[PDB]
Amino acid sequence: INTDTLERVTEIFKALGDYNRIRIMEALSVSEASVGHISHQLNLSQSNVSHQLKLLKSVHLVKAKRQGQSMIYSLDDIHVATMLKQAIHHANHPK
Amino acid sequence: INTDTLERVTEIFKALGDYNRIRIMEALSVSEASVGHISHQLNLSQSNVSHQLKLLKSVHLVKAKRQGQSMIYSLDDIHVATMLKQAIHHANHPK
Numbered sequence: 763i764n765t766d767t768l769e770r771v772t773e774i775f776k777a778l779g780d781y782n783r784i785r786i787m788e789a790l791s792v793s794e795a796s797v798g799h800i801s802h803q804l805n806l807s808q809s810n811v812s813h814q815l816k817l818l819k820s821v822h823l824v825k826a827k828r829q830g831q832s833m834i835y836s837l838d839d840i841h842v843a844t845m846l847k848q849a850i851h852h853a854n855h856p857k
Numbered sequence: 858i859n860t861d862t863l864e865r866v867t868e869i870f871k872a873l874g875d876y877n878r879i880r881i882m883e884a885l886s887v888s889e890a891s892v893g894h895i896s897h898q899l900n901l902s903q904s905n906v907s908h909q910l911k912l913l914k915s916v917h918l919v920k921a922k923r924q925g926q927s928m929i930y931s932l933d934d935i936h937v938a939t940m941l942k943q944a945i946h947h948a949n950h951p952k
């Protein structure tokens with residue numbers, strides 16, 4: 763399949779090969795949330811979390827939507843949710 | 858969720874952040890196959906393909922099964938298949 767495609771896939775997985783980015787993604791899989799709420803959940807700086815989310819948004823793994831007086835991040839779409847959830851499933855069984 | 862877990866997840870995604878490993882995985886998503894058959898499909902050395910498959914087997918993304926006089930590699934299980942297919946889906950639509 764296409765080279766522009768299999769390159770976008772590698773930048774997606776590349777982006778996911780980082781422990782705190784995975785922690786951010788897995789939190790978002792529970793609930794969309796603001797940068798402040800995420801940094802509180804994970805005990806990371808708002809500066810650090812914001813930087814990571816823009817990296818993730820760069821490869822279309824997260825998106826950001828104004829809601830009221832907050833900027834709310836979410837997993838981009840159902841593909842991202844399913845991909846992450848299957849990965850965690852696989853990491854948690856034997857063989 | 859657990860640190861042994863979210864570390865196994867990062868090594869999975871880490872392992873997938875490589876163009877030829879993705880090409881190998883995507884070929885296997887079409888059909889299980891021997892090292893020779895893969896290296897022919899992809900025009901890569903058998904030495905290179907074998908090295909990559911042992912890396913992938915290390916993080917339980919592929920498995921290897923004797924069948925007749927051949928050693929056949931496959932995607933480990935349905936979780937891996939779904940994860941890869943969702944990633945490629947996501948890479949191929951807009952927004």
Ligand SMILES: [Cl-]
Binds near residue numbers: 792793794
């Ligand atoms: Cl939500």
Ligand SMILES: [Cl-]
């Ligand atoms: Cl922005």
Ligand SMILES: [Cl-]
Binds near residue numbers: 887889
């Ligand atoms: Cl098959």
Ligand SMILES: [Cl-]
């Ligand atoms: Cl072996």
Ligand SMILES: [Zn+2]
Binds near residue numbers: 855937
């Ligand atoms: Zn599995």
Ligand SMILES: [Zn+2]
Binds near residue numbers: 839840842948
């Ligand atoms: Zn998608």
